[PDB]
Symmetry: C5
Subunit: 92 residues, 5 copies
């Protein structure tokens, strides 16, 4: 079981691919630093044929969210904001 | 243990049925896409229970640790969908 | 490991008797609402819900023995939801 | 694995002592009822360390959720004055 | 499995090095003991600098997390008028 984390910028999706036999557990999503805050940030994931919304972050009110997400297969994270950091751990 | 998720549309209850041997763990409920109160309902057996209430401005999502071993129906009410996300795992 | 949940009505305390009962959350149905539990000679407060701001709370509570859940809302119920496991 | 909980009164710090081989897991801290706006820092002492577990608030933050494990003796405390703070969780081996 | 916790003072980022065999699980970050202001939480691990969340004096005094560190990492914050306590447990 080992640390995992990625920085997702605005726009094109970041594709993450667990090696066969490994799970990526995502524990949280947190906004990066913005110096002109006012704004809402939907978090999108694509997994197989499914396109889902993981949550909506907000400057000032909802800078991060906590989660218990497991990815066994390839997945794409995306948003349209600044960056969003997704952090967790890998495990078999 | 593998990814699970559904998009539930308004007034249109989705029935989820775990395959024999498998648990569905629900980790969260999140509003879809911004411009006022959304009770989340579940029906396991005859128990029509309330899982929480989302709110457009303040409570766009909630986090949870819910396990379903048997069939269940998720539902809400008006101008969007609620995504329920988690994972499946054996018993 | 199997689904567990109860509806606690106002002024009608529910006694639950276990297997472990894991409570994962408390949610208002339908101002402030203290949640009370009685376990093993102790009477404790599990949290306070609020109609406009705090409709639910999340928790990691384990009950190995008998316990009683209660609240004093009057104009609704509080749903406690989780799972049973050995 | 079995239920654990304490009521900590204001200015009366409670010392909890796990028997050797047992862990005390604290899952949450919740304000009791008072009567206005008052912040409530939660303190713990473990060995030579004095740490802050969080700050509760009467109107906005009546409780907090946590995943805290104590293998050794520890002291919980707060300075509210007009109430108690309940700490709840479970005991388990290892 | 045993208690772990640190006090990170302002402008003094702490480098944590898990003892051989052990993972450090961080369960939460909490502001110490006015003013309304924001406090980004930073971690450095390997080649990565990531943001764990943003605390706020009036609204968000603490946050809850499920973070696992298998290797050396540095925790840091930018408050200036206090410390941030990171608390959790060590486990093999």
């Amino acid at each position: 079981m080992e640390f995992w984390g990625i920085e997702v910028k605005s726009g094109k999706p970041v594709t993450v691919t667990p090696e066969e036999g490994i799970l990526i557990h995502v524990s949280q999503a947190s906004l990066g630093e913005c110096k002109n805050k006012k704004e809402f940030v939907p978090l999108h994931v694509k997994v197989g044929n499914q396109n889902l919304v993981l949550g909506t972050l907000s400057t000032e009110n909802i800078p991060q969210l906590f989660c218990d997400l497991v990815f066994d297969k390839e997945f794409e994270l995306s948003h349209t904001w600044g960056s969003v950091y997704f952090v967790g751990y890998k495990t078999p």
